[PDB]
Every structure is written in C-alpha cells, then in structure tokens.
Write a protein that binds this ligand. Structure first.
Ligand SMILES: C[C@H](CCC(=O)NCCC[N+](C)(C)C[C@H](O)CS(=O)(=O)O)[C@H]1CC[C@H]2[C@@H]3[C@H](O)C[C@@H]4C[C@H](O)CC[C@]4(C)[C@H]3C[C@H](O)[C@]12C
Ligand SMILES: C[C@H](CCC(=O)NCCC[N+](C)(C)C[C@H](O)CS(=O)(=O)O)[C@H]1CC[C@H]2[C@@H]3[C@H](O)C[C@@H]4C[C@H](O)CC[C@]4(C)[C@H]3C[C@H](O)[C@]12C
Ligand SMILES: Nc1ncnc2c1ncn2[C@@H]1O[C@H](COP(=O)(O)OP(=O)(O)O)[C@@H](O)[C@H]1O
Ligand SMILES: [Mg+2]
Ligand SMILES: [Zn+2]
Ligand SMILES: [Zn+2]
Ligand SMILES: [Zn+2]
Ligand SMILES: [Zn+2]
Ligand SMILES: [Zn+2]
Lengths: 590, 142, 75, 662, 142
C-alpha cells in the first residue's frame, strides 16, 4: 500500500491517523504534520501502535522500531531505533522525498471543523491536490455530522400512511424531507433487523409523520429509526483540467445555416471550439442555458453530456432540448433510488444516446466530445472533481452565474462566503473574468429586471421586454408557525388563497417559498405546483407566487431573493416580509 | 552465541519480508499500468525508427487525418482517409494527387459528412465553409 | 540495428492492438495477425516497413481508442 | 449400409475368405479372441485394411440405455475399433441404484452423454469426421503475441548486438494466431491414412525392438506408489470445469483409484481429449497444439505404465536416453556410449515429418504392446487386452474436443497421454530396425563379400517369411549385429546413429535412403533429405540432437563434448517473455541465471559473436542485481544483510555445471 | 528443560495435526462439491435428450447397442453448419432449406465468426468479402 504525498507528490507509505480521510504523507511532511498539531497516530503498511501484549501508546513521537514491530518506550528490545526522529517519520521511500512548506495550510485544512468563514476560503485557494483533499474532508465532515441527529421511535400507528414518532431526548431533530432516508428496526429480543428504508414528511393535521417506505411491512410500536450515512468515495481527478488554447477547431465540425435564433452566438461557439474549457457568465434568463442548446445545434456531430447539481436545473435543460433538439437522439439519467420524480419524456437511462442529461453525482463513466456543466454556482469542488473523473471529453463548458445562490454548505454558520470562493470555476469567473459573457434579460419583464439590476448587478441589465403590468408585490407581516427548522407561515398562504379566487388566469402559477416545509404545506391549501428557491435555479415559469416566510438571514438573502424573482416569464406576485426589501423593489403596491 | 543466533534468525526473517514485500509491490504495480506503459513504449519505439512513412501517417493522425481502413500495399487498391479541415486538405492533396504514407495516391471520390458526392473543384479557400466537413477521400494507390 | 527494431515494434504494436480489443473483430484480427507474422519472417527491411505501415494504420484507424496527440506530445 | 449396424464380423470374414483365402494363419475379426500379443498385431493389421470398406459412422463407442434409480442414461458399453474389432464391456449394470465417485467419474468422462445430448454439427473447415457440437456457438481461440522485454533489448543493442550482417540474429519469436488456428491445426490429422503394415516383417521388428527394451522392468503399481510430478495441471474435458488434477487426486482415496484401475482392465472407457493451443516461443509460425487427456485416462495409464516409465528414465547407458541430463558431463557420456566400438563411424540423424500425425495406428498399437510386455506376471491375458483397448480408445482414436465441438480423431499419437515420449521412442526404434531389415534384404546377395553377413541375409529372410515362431537365437544375433554396426541414441524422436560406414556404403545397414523408403511406405510421408544430416568427422559430434549442437572443447585437462544452443534461441528467450510481469527483470534474476546456465558453452565457441551471448547474460545479471539493491535500498534504508547473488555473475558457478564431478 | 522442550514439541505436533485436519476437511468438502456438480451436469444432459427418436432408434437395434456417432445424426434437432467461404455455402445450404443426413433442415439463424447475426440476403458473391467468415448457420430438423 504505497501512495503519493498530498502536498509534494513524493512517494510514501504513511497515512495520518487522526485525519478523517487518511491522506498519504511523505516522511518529512508527516513529521511536520504530527509535530505541530495533535494528530499523533500514523499508519504505515501496519499501524504504529505499540506491539506489546497489552499497551496503549500510539503517539509516534514515543514509539521505537525493534525486530519487526513497533514497541513503546517500556517494551523496546535493545536493537531498536526511534521512528519520529531526525525530522522524518520513518516509512518506506524515506530518503527519496521532498519536503514542503504548505504544512501550515494542510494542518488548517485537516484540523478545522469547517464551521467558521475562513476554512472555505482556505479550501479554495490552495493547490489542486489540497483542493481535492479539502473537498473530501468537507464531504466527510458533512456526513459525520448526520450521526449527531436524533433517533426516532414509534409511539403508535395512527394510519398505514400516518405514523406517530417520538425523538430521542437531548439530540436535535433531523429535518423531515426526502433527502434524509431512515432505516427501521424491531430490535427487542427477537430480530435486531432492518425492516425497510423509510422517509418522512410532516402531515398537515396533528403530529403525524406521514411516511413513505420501500417495503410493505406493518409497523409495530417498538420499531425505531436510525438515519443512514453515506460513505464518501475518495476522489482523484483535478477540479479544472488544464487549459490548452488550440490553433484551430478540433473534434467539432460546425454547421451550415444553424438557425436564426442562435445566429448571434456564433463567435462564442468558435471560442468554445478553440479552448479546452470555457466559462460563461451571465445574469439570469439571458441565454446561458439556451447557449448550451445552441452549442448542440452548431456542432451536430458532437456528442454532448449536459450536467447540473440539482434536478430542476437539468430538467430545465431537458425541456429546452425537448423544444429544440431531436428527441430520438437524446436521453436522461435517473438514479435507481430516486426519492424525487424527474423529467420523463426522453428515453430514460440510455447513456449511449448522443445527448445525455444528468445530475453530477449520478454520472456514468463515459466519454463525450463537449460536456456542458450548467449551474456552477451550485457546485462544490467535489462535484467538479466527480465530473472530471467520470466524463472524459474534448471540451468543457461551465455555464452559470456567481450572483445566484450557492451550494448550501450546511456547516457554515459564522460568516459569509463571497462568490469567488464557491468553487474553483466561480473563482475563475471572479478572478480573471469569464471567457464568454451575455447580459440582456430575454426572459423576465422589464419591471423584474429593473428591480433586480439594482440589488445585485449594479445597473448592468436591460430587458428585451417592457413593463408588463403583472408584477405585484405586497407587504404582509405573516405571523409564523415553526416546523422542525423550516418555518411555515399560514396567513401568507391565506392572502395567496385570496389571490387565487380573484385572479383566474394565475391558477397555473408556481409557488416559490424559501422553506421546504411551507412548500409542501401550501400544496394542500392551494394545489399549485411548488418549488423551493434553492431548487428553482434555472427553470422559468409563466406566473410565480413568491412568499417570504420569515424575517431572518436566510429568506432575506438578496441572492436568494434575486433567484426567486427572476423566474417569472410574464407575471409575479410577491408576498413580502421585510420592510426594506419591499421598499427596495418597485412593483405595484397591492 | 544463543542470543546472536536469535538475532540472525530475526534478521533473516526481516530480509525475506523485505524481498517478498518488494516483489509483491512491484509486480502488482507493473500489472496495473500495463496499457499505458505499453502504449508509451510503442510510441517511443516508433519515434526511434525515424521512418519517413510512419512519421507521415502519425503526423497526419495527430491533426485528424486518419484512414478509415487498413492502408493497402498493392498497386491500384483502395484507401479511404478522412480529412477534417481545409488546411489538412491543402497539406496532403495537390490537384488530384494525394501524398500519404510517403506514397502518391490518385483521388477517385470525395464525399461529405452528409454522404453527398463532391467534386474537387468545390474545395476552395472560400467555398470550404459551405462544405460539410470532414471529407472522406477514396483514393487508389499509384 | 534497423531490421531488428521493426521486428520488435511489431510485437509491441500487436500487443497494443490486442489490448485495445481488436480481436473481437475477427476479420480485422486476421489481417493484423498476418501482418505481424509477415514482419517477423522478413529478410528485407523495405517490405517490413511497408507491412509495418499497414499494421500501424489499424491502430490509427480507431479514433478514440488511443490519444495520439497526448502520446506523441512527450516526444 | 444399415445405419445402426455396428458388428461387421461376418463381412470381415467374407472379405478375408475372398482375397486372403490361402493365408493359413487364423484371423479373429474381433481381437478380443486373440491368443497373445502377436496375434493381436496380425488380426489388427488385417482389420486396418478391411475397416476401410465399412461406413465411418459405425466406429466409435457403442451406447446403450441403462437406468440409474429409474432415470434413463445412455452410456457407452463397448467400442468398435477400426483395428481391434468389436470390444464389449463386461461389467455393465442395466439397473443400478446409486452412483459412487468412481461410477460418476466414468459416466462424466465418457463421450456418450456429451455427444448424445448436443446439436449435430457439420464442420466444413475440416475433413475429419465431426460428431457433435456441445455449445450453441463454436469457439474461436486466438494466440496472443508475446510481451517485449525492452530493457534487455536496449541492453543488448548497447553491447553491440543485432547489427546488420550479424551472425546472431533474432529468429525465435512469439507468433500470433487468428481465430481458425485450433481447427486449422487439428486438420493436419488429414495426413493420417489407414496403413496396413507388412505383417511378416512387423512381427520380427517387434521382437528386435523388444530386445532393445529388455533391461528394464515394469508392472502394475498400486495407487499409493504413483508419483505425479505437478498436480496443478488441468484434467481434460469435462473435468476442467470444476478443478485441476489436484481435485481428482485428492477426492478419490486409494481404494477408489485402485477400483477404477481394476475397472479398466475389464471395461473400455472412451474419453474426450481437448486440443489446447500452445503459447510458447518458436521459430516457425505454424500453431502448435497439445492434446490434454482426461484425468480418467491419465490416472489409470499412470498406474499401468509408471514402473516401466520410471525405470527407463533411471537407466544410464541404454539406447533410450530419456532421463540422462546434459549437465555435469552427461552429454559427454551419452555421446561416448553412442560410439560403442562401431568400426568406421559416421553419425547420422533423421527427421520424421509430422511425427505425431502421420504415425499409423499399427505402429502406435505396436508401441503400446511393447510397453506392456513387462506385465507377464501381474496381469492376465484379457487384462492386457482391455488395457490395450483402453489405450486405443483414450489415446489413439478418441473424440477430440476442438473448440466446443467433438470431432473424431482418426489416429496417430496424441501428445499428452501418460506414455508419449516413450511410445514415441518405441516407434522410432521400430522404424530404424525396419530400415535395417529393408536395407539388408534389398541388397543383392551375391555381392555381399563377407560370408558372415550373406548368411545373415539368408537367415533373416527365412526368419521373416518362412517361420511362424519367434527364433530367439536369430533375434539375439541380429540385435547383436545392430548394436555392433548401427549404434543408436533415442530421445523420443531425436535419434543419433553411429553407423559403420563401410557397411552402409556396401548396403548392409541403413543409410538415409532406406529411411526415406521406410517412411514412404510405412508412414505415408516423404522425408526430404534436407533435414537429415550426416557427420563424417567424429570430433565434431552430432550436428544437432535435442536442438543442441555439440562441440569438442578442452576442459580440465582432457577433451569433452559440450552442448550449446542456438544463440537466437537464448536471446529470444531474453527479449520476448510470455507474461507481462516477466518483463520486469529485477524480480526475475533466476530466469537469467537459468538462461545463462543454458548459454554457458557458447563461451568456448570460436565465433566471437556467439561467445558474447554468455557475457551479455552475465553483465545483465550484474546490472539487474545492482538496480535491485538500488530499489530495495530506496524502499527502505537498509540493504539486505545477507546477499549471495554475487556468484551468479562469475563464470565459475556456470562452468561447474558442465564438469563431471556430480 | 525436559518439560519445556516437551511442551514445545507437543504444541508443534498439535498444530501440525490441526493443519492436517483442516486439509482433510477442505478435501472432503471439495469432493462433495464436485460430486454435486457432476450429478447436476448429468441430469441436465438427461433433460436435454430427444426421447422420442432416441427411443425409436434404440428399440430398433437388434442388441440394444447403437454406435455413438449416429445418436446425433438421427436424433439431434439442431444442426450447426460451419462454413469457411462462399463456394462451400453455395454448395451445402443454399436457400432456406437443405438436406443433410437424409433429413430436411430449415435455416433458423446464420451468425458469423463475430457472433453477429447475418441475414440470408447478405450472403452473395459480391458481399462475400465483407462478411467475417466462417459462417455458423443453425438449422432445425423439419
Ligand atoms: C530492522 C530493519 C532495519 C534496522 C537498521 O538496520 N537501522 C540502521 C539505521 C539506518 N536508518 C536510516 C534506518 C535509520 C527495518 C528497516 C525497514 C523495515 C521494514 C518495513 O519498514 C516494513 C515491513 C512491513 C512490516 O511492518 C514488518 C516487515 C517490514 C519488511 C520491515 C522489517 C524491518 O522492520 C525493517 C527491515
Ligand atoms: C495343410 C495345408 C498346408 C500345411 C493348408 C495350408 C492352407 C490351407 C487352406 C486354407 O487355410 C483354408 C481353405 C478353406 C477351408 O478351411 C479348407 C480348404 C482350404 C483350401 C485350406 C486347405 C489346407 O488345409 C491348406 C492348403
Ligand atoms: N438569442 C435569443 N433571442 C431571444 N430570446 C432568447 C435568446 N436566447 C434565449 N432567449 C430566451 O431567454 C430565456 C433564457 O433562458 P435560459 O437560457 O434558461 O436562461 P438562464 O440560463 O439564465 O436560466 C429563454 O427562455 C429563451 O426563451
Ligand atoms: Mg439557465
Ligand atoms: Zn492528521
Ligand atoms: Zn510530503
Ligand atoms: Zn508499550
Ligand atoms: Zn488373432
Ligand atoms: Zn499389469
């Protein structure tokens, strides 16, 4: 079991033991890491524990090598020599190793608990192998935080689709949505056995936890629930494959008389051909996700994989391809588990079609000829590393905007992450500028662009529309109730219910609220399609009913508000909560 | 001498452990990277030969001008090579002769990616954006 | 050594073709094998180089199986 | 002919009474009625002729529907051999209760179930009769090329090898094969014709060959005395679908192996034998195939022949030099016992073209009847007949499985049974004695000046064509003549002969042209005289025997013969290896020690470019060990404490292998 | 010294007997597994018989023995013909029915050497070069 040191890529055999990911480390770097922090456990081809019959000494500064085993200070044979000596912990390839100085950064990456604001800015301006290691340890920390959630136990079964749950005392309740799957148990005497993978949702009336299940078992009183935790796969591929400006287009053959719609995008298509990876940045609704379909129709012999981190972003791409691209030579990939329903009009799960569509986590190991990664703001360096490990291709086009809302980063609570730290590509668009840029709002009415080009994008947007007189925003305080952690606001659903009998054309509008639970609970009063702001990024709607639930730091986030209000194609109703933001936009009063 | 015998037995077992661990590590490493090592070895050997036909077909295959079948040896047999861009056409073709693999070939027929036949007078510095690349040239050995 | 570098490059080149799963296409593997065995039993360097061109052109014929611009870059 | 008619005894008797009517010796159409192993050669030699007028579908096993606990099997209860006539099993159980391990082994080995439950096949790729096709799609098996060992090749051209006009050049490579190799190589059994042999002459050449095999001893041995060399060697078809031969030598306790072996002395077990394509370095691009014989045949043949076959390999000084090493002065001693006081020696060596495919069935039956003359006491007569029928059903004319399809092998030895180098040696001695008999009889007789030899020609004709009983006085006298003037040395088909030259010039002993004639009428191949050498000068030794040339060097204080290989072979074993991990070098220093042990005598060769091959291997072992300790000092920081590889690059460790002390 | 060397010899012997007991258990388990595999192989080959025609020919023999070589030739339901080139194909099984072993066979499939299905409209004198010979035509007894 030999490997490569993370921060100098020398050959080595050690692995730090207190770090969650066990990064391979060369000898000098391992001494630097175990002499400064408190990570004192090291594993070679065998661990560095004391091989006494009974002894617990693991601190590598203490152990000695004797015979063919490592003994502590009080069991060493007189033919022995210290490991942690001379500035080098002894491992294989000891004298062919190059020291480094980044051990003042690798310590901070491997030591921190990822809660402060600075750890993400350090996980994104380091070297590439440290970017991969930092992303991997962040994924591992987010996974082992899920073990800190409570444990459920059934009190009674009110109905076959209505359980009743009591949570463990002193441990926080998990949020109840289809992200978090639980496993059942009947552990009494008598069968400490999993009885199915379930998932919950808080039913409207009573303390009923309406559960969906894989199996068809009857649930007793004693059945109890434990959250599942997914092991983090280690990652290898670089975040950004190195750029190589070509002289002339390779692998792509352009087209004769593409269309009259994508005629103004031809120069950017030639630029995509010339480079290796290119980055596109535009304010919302300005042709970014349209540009990818135009890339499809400008290089018709080019096999393309479209990818995004959500499912509604890739579904917006799927709809645009349904409108434009030929539907026989297209596809769509859905994972087997699939707690959420996806777009089903393409020949699902046929990766050999010329135009594949996928979420970045569920990609299959394949090739392409140009791969389009839409919505890079919602991507972490784990996601870009996964898309660089699976998909091997000739050109990469990263499309997205940093001013929309990022990956959530559940651990981050103290501070704010500027756009140039969201991942590597968003840093590239905020360091040197994007390779391709298109700002002109071709989707939203000019009222929406007039109020959204003053909040984030400082007066840089003009619309190919006019004031469409269907942009209403009202100010109603909305006395809130509290769910698990995602608040629910009854009286604002009430005023929306009033705005549904008294405006008939709007019954096709889509509900948008920053909280998942209110998005579930306003379907049973209204019946409209419902979408959360975080998962609404990239798909537009004819009419949008937005409801600011609470006055907080989350729902009064201007990026979240911007991606909320720039999805209405022709009409929007915005039930606000904050006074200043309600004064910041310029709608009708209502 | 009893203790020195114990030391000799221990160092002999250490020596066998070193040898067996090295053999296992090197053998599994060699059997892992077998595809890439063989391809790198092949192209090292191909550059070492310095033949003027192998160099020509490799320097064409870098640009994108690869043959679609096995290159023939017989006089007056058929070879179909794809030419991706006009400049690659200009480097290899002249009039109707076609200089490939250090041999002269007589062009018979140039088709497009839409499988329409094309005359060699359409292939111009100016009309080429109106073509449908990559051409497939069917030629015969001189 | 010029004759006995083509006799060894045939061995390496047919090993590369066999690792690329040429031999699942029987009509192509018959011709690759015939070119290999004709190079190995050759006494004149000209005919060995013509058969080597024909054999290598099988490897260049398959587009994405190798990455010729990456392998030739290091030289 | 009726399709199901399998018993042609009356037709054979009508043919024999129409053509050979006044041939007075008895003819038993089924050889199971015969009286000794000289009435089996007689009646087998007749049935070789007659069985070419009978339909070819009526030979092979005779199935019969038996019942095991109520379920109906179809299993083989006999055989109908082209040479041996109809042979019926004696222990057939038409209603059996359960299947033990022995009965299960027998019913899975035999081809009656496999051919009876497969699709009919018509293979136009061959001419050999095709029985069935077990799979739904025939399998095309390729042979990959060998892996290049580029480090050694660059070391070799660094030392100045492989230049233009070199006397040492690569000719031994790893040749690859396309899909139709195994069935375009099995098709060489079309060279096997049904040859009737001259039976009044074969029944004398058998006695002289038996005199050549007189000093050894043999018999049946029990299953606990059987020595298997390597037990991880595959067990043929269908047993290779579940394990190696280790599994079937571990599952059957010695009672269950003795019971199977005592079963084959009263029953015939037909057997399927695979044809494996060989992957090894060679000089010519024809594919080479080896017949992997079923463990049900190899076990019993090992018990039957192992005592004789391990007493041939342990006798030094005989004609059959199998088991005499060329190291430690063994080659000198072999070459000195060839020259056992022949008068005016010339060495001679011949070459059977297609030795294992053209070899007739009668000479393979003679080889198996000479290897089974040692059982005068341990076996009865019918036991020896049923062992002959089991060899002819599992080895000679078996069902060959060639890529998912059962074909019928027409005849000639299969290179993988338990007695193949030795049965080949008996065939080789038989052809040399037949050449001498033809050369001595075909001489004039008035021109033979030596009054002893002319009387020997007269007595020889009389003992061939005028006696019916073996004349041990003259058989001993003619064998003494052959040893005095035609000394041989035999390794399975490589023969070196040290014949008297005045005699063979006068015509009293076989020259090359007599072997050309004998192989014409008794092998159906033409032996071209560009593969048979004649060395008139004994201080150069045999020009080639067992692929090693021989040279007379000065060693110690006296002159010895030493074997040296072909230098292209040793360099080809360096540069081209058949597994990817053998390319590494540093792991394989024993590979280069063995190659340098084989290439040591090239140092005493006078061509300097030959003598550099040994120093190339010594310098390569030194470089390999230097870079090995370099890497094993990097991986650790301590060199090996004890290291005795320092002697593999001194020439004394190698020269000690060719000095006669051990 | 006596007792300690006695116990060392004793525990060496006991570990040896344990190792040989492990070896015997492994051998007997593998014998059981091989006997199961042989029995299921024989019983599947029993179920694959064609018992009508097989009973007819076995009951038509005067002793009950028929040569093995004519068990398939008169009871097999599928005939696989392997054909090396086109003249052989034209002579043995031209068209969709043919004759062999005094029966009539109907061609149910033709695959090539690559296990790809080849339609009967392909096998012509001008498309004979582009087929991966030999052709395996599978026919059924009519
Ligand atoms: C005793 C011997 C060297 C002692 C010495 O001579 N020091 C002299 C000073 C020189 N310097 C540079 C080492 C300091 C040390 C050095 C390297 C050690 C091997 C590998 O690590 C690990 C490997 C796997 C298992 O863990 C146990 C077996 C293995 C083979 C080890 C055996 C033993 O443990 C070795 C040989
Ligand atoms: C006695 C005499 C020589 C001593 C032997 C040698 C060959 C023998 C003949 C054939 O064998 C068989 C033939 C068919 C019948 O069997 C009987 C008549 C026949 C004509 C025999 C007669 C007699 O018996 C012969 C001449
Ligand atoms: N070249 C164009 N001319 C006119 N309208 C366009 C053009 N390109 C895109 N649009 C419109 O603008 C909208 C932009 O959609 P999309 O590409 O999804 O924006 P985003 O990528 O910001 O979500 C599309 O609905 C499309 O109808
Ligand atoms: Mg978009
Ligand atoms: Zn650590
Ligand atoms: Zn390091
Ligand atoms: Zn201790
Ligand atoms: Zn007889
Ligand atoms: Zn016996």
């Amino acid at each position: 079991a030999v490997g490569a040191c993370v921060l100098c890529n020398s050959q080595t055999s050690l692995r730090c033991g207190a770090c969650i990911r066990r990064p391979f480390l060369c000898c000098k770097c391992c001494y630097d890491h175990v002499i400064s922090t408190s990570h004192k456990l090291v594993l070679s081809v065998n661990p560095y524990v004391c091989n006494a019959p009974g002894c617990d000494v693991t601190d590598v500064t203490q152990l000695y090598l004797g015979g063919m085993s490592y003994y502590c200070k009080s069991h060493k044979p007189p033919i022995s020599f210290p490991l942690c000596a001379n500035g080098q912990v002894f491992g294989l390839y000891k004298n062919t190793c190059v020291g480094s100085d980044n051990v003042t950064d690798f310590n901070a990456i491997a030591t921190c608990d990822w809660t402060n604001a600075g750890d993400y800015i350090l996980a994104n301006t380091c070297t590439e192998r440290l970017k991969l290691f930092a992303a991997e340890t962040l994924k591992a920390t987010e996974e082992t935080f899920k073990l800190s959630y409570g444990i459920a136990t059934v009190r009674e079964v009110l109905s076959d689709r209505e359980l009743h749950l009591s949570w463990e005392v002193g441990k926080p309740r998990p949020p109840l949505n289809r992200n978090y799957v639980f496993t059942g148990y009947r552990v009494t005497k008598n069968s400490k056995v999993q009885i199915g993978e379930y998932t919950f949702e808080k039913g409207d009336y009573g303390d009923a936890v309406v559960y969906r299940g894989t199996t068809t078992y009857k649930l007793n009183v004693g059945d109890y629930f434990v959250l599942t935790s997914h092991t983090v796969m280690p990652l290898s591929a670089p975040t950004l494959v190195p750029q190589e400006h070509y002289v002339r287009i390779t692998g792509l053959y352009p087209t004769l008389n593409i269309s009259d719609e994508f005629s103004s995008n031809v120069a950017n298509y030639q630029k995509v051909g010339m480079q290796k990876y290119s980055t596109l940045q535009g304010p919302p609704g300005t042709g970014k996700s349209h540009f990818a379909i135009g890339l499809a129709l400008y290089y018709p012999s080019a096999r393309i994989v479209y990818t995004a981190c959500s499912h509604a972003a890739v579904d917006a791409l799927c709809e645009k391809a349904l409108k434009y691209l030929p539907i026989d030579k297209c596809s769509r990939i859905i994972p087997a588990r699939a707690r959420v329903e996806c777009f089903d009009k393409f020949k699902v799960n046929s990766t050999l079609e010329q135009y594949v569509f996928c979420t970045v986590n569920a990609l299959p190991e394949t090739t392409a000829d140009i791969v389009v990664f839409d919505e890079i703001s919602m991507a972490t360096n784990y996601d870009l590393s996964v898309v660089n490990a699976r998909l091997r291709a000739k050109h990469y086009v990263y499309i997205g905007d940093p001013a929309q809302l990022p990956a959530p980063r559940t651990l981050l609570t103290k501070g704010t992450l500027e756009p140039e730290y969201f991942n590597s590509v968003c840093r590239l668009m905020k360091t040197i500028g994007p390779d391709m840029f298109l700002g002109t709002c071709r989707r939203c009415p000019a009222e929406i662009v007039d109020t959204v080009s003053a909040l984030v994008y400082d007066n840089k947007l003009k619309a190919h529309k006019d004031k469409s007189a269907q942009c209403f925003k009202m100010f109603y305080k909305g006395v809130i109730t509290h769910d698990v952690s995602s608040a629910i606001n009854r009286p604002q659903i009430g005023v929306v219910r009033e705005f549904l009998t008294r405006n008939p054309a709007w019954r096709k509008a889509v509900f948008i609220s920053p909280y998942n639970s209110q998005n579930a609970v306003a379907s049973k009063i209204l019946g409209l399609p419902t979408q959360t702001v975080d998962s609404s990024q990239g798909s537009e709607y004819d009419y949008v009913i937005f409801t600011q639930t609470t006055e907080t730091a989350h729902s009064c986030n201007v990026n979240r508000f911007n991606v909320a209000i720039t999805r209405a194609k022709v009409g929007i109703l915005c039930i606000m909560s904050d006074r200043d933001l309600y004064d910041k936009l310029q709608f009708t009063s209502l | 001498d009893r203790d020195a015998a114990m030391q000799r037995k221990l160092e002999k077992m250490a020596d066998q452990a070193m040898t067996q661990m090295y053999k296992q590590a090197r053998s599994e490493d060699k059997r892992a990277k077998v595809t890439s090592a063989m391809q790198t070895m092949l192209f090292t050997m191909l550059r070492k030969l310095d033949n003027d036909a192998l160099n020509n077909i490799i320097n064409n295959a870098r640009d994108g001008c690869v043959p679609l079948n096995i290159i023939p040896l017989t006089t007056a047999a058929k070879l179909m090579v794809v030419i991706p861009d006009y400049n690659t056409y200009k480097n290899t073709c002249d009039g109707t002769t076609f200089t490939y693999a250090s041999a002269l070939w007589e062009i018979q027929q140039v088709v497009d990616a839409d499988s329409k036949i094309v005359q060699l007078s359409e292939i111009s510095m100016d009309n080429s954006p109106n073509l449908a690349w990559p051409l497939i040239v069917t030629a015969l050995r001189a | 050594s010029k004759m006995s570098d083509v006799k060894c490059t045939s061995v390496v080149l047919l090993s590369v073709l066999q690792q690329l799963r040429v031999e699942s296409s029987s009509k192509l593997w018959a011709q690759c094998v015939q070119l290999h065995n004709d190079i190995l039993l050759a006494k004149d360097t000209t005919e060995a180089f013509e058969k080597m061109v024909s054999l290598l052109s099988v490897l260049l014929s398959m587009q994405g199986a190798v990455d010729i611009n990456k392998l030739c870059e290091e030289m | 002919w009726d399709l199901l008619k399998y018993d042609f005894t009356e037709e054979r008797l009508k043919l024999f009474d129409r053509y050979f009517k006044y041939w007075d010796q008895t003819y038993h159409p089924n050889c199971v009625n015969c009286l000794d192993d000289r009435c089996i050669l007689h009646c087998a030699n007749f049935n070789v002729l007659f069985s070419t007028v009978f339909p070819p579908t009526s030979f092979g096993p005779l199935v019969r529907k038996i019942f095991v606990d109520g379920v109906p099997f179809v299993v083989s209860t006999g055989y109908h051999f082209r040479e041996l006539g109809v042979v019926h099993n004696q222990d057939v159980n038409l209603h059996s209760s359960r299947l033990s391990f022995k009965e299960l082994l027998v019913y899975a080995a035999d081809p009656a179930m496999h051919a009876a439950s497969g699709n009919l096949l018509l293979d136009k790729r061959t001419t050999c009769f095709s029985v069935a096709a077990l799979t739904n799609n025939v399998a095309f098996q390729t042979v990959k090329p060998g892996n290049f060992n580029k480090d050694f090749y660059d070391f070799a051209v660094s030392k100045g090898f492989f230049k233009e006009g070199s006397s040492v050049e690569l000719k031994h490579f790893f040749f690859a094969q396309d899909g139709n190799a195994a069935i375009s190589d099995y098709d060489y059994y079309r060279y096997n014709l049904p040859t009737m042999c001259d039976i009044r002459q074969l029944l004398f050449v058998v006695e002289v060959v038996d005199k050549y095999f007189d000093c050894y001893d043999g018999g049946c041995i029990n299953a606990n005395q059987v020595i298997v060399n390597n037990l991880d060697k595959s067990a043929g078809f269908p047993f290779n679908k579940w394990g190696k031969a280790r599994l079937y030598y571990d599952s059957m306790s010695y009672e269950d192996q003795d019971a199977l072996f005592a079963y084959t002395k009263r029953n015939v077990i037909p057997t399927i034998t695979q044809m494996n394509l060989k992957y090894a370095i060679s000089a010519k691009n024809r594919a080479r195939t080896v017949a992997g014989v079923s463990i049900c045949s190899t076990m019993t043949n090992r018990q039957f022949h192992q005592k004789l076959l391990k007493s041939i390999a342990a006798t030094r000084g005989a004609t059959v030099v199998i088991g005499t090493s060329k190291f430690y002065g063994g080659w000198h001693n072999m070459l000195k016992t060839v020259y056992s006081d022949v008068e005016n020696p010339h060495l001679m060596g011949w070459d059977y073209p297609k030795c294992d495919r053209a070899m007739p069935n009668m000479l393979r039956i003679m080889a198996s009847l000479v290897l089974a003359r040692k059982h005068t006491t341990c076996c009865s007569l019918s036991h020896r007949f049923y062992r002959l029928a089991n060899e002819c059903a599992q080895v000679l004319s078996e069902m060959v499985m060639c890529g998912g399809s059962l074909y019928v092998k027409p005849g000639g030895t299969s290179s993988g049974d338990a007695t193949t180098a030795y049965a080949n040696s008996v065939f080789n001695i038989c052809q040399a004695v037949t050449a001498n008999v033809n050369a001595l009889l075909s001489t004039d007789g008035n021109k033979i000046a030596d009054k002893y030899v002319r009387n020997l020609q007269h007595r020889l004709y009389e003992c061939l064509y005028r006696n019916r009983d073996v004349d041990t006085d003259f058989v001993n006298e003619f064998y003494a003549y052959l040893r005095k003037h035609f000394s041989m040395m035999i390794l399975s088909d490589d023969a070196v002969v040290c014949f008297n030259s005045t005699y063979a010039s006068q015509g009293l002993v076989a020259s090359i042209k007599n072997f050309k004639s004998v192989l014409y009428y008794q092998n159906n191949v033409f032996m071209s005289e560009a593969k048979c050498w004649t060395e008139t000068d004994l201080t150069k030794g045999p020009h080639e025997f067992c692929s090693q040339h021989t040279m007379l060097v000065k060693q110690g204080d006296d002159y010895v013969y030493l074997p040296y290989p072909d230098p292209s072979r040793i360099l080809g074993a360096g540069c081209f290896v058949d597994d990817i991990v053998k390319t590494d070098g540093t792991l394989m220093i024993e590979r280069f020690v063995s190659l340098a042990i084989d290439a040591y005598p090239l140092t005493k060769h006078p061509n300097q470019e030959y003598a550099d091959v040994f120093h190339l291997y010594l310098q390569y072992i030194r470089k390999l060990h230097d870079e090995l300790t370099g890497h094993m000092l990097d991986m650790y920081s301590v060199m090996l404490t004890n290291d005795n590889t320092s002697r593999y690059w001194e020439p004394e460790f190698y020269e000690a292998m060719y000095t006669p002390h051990t």
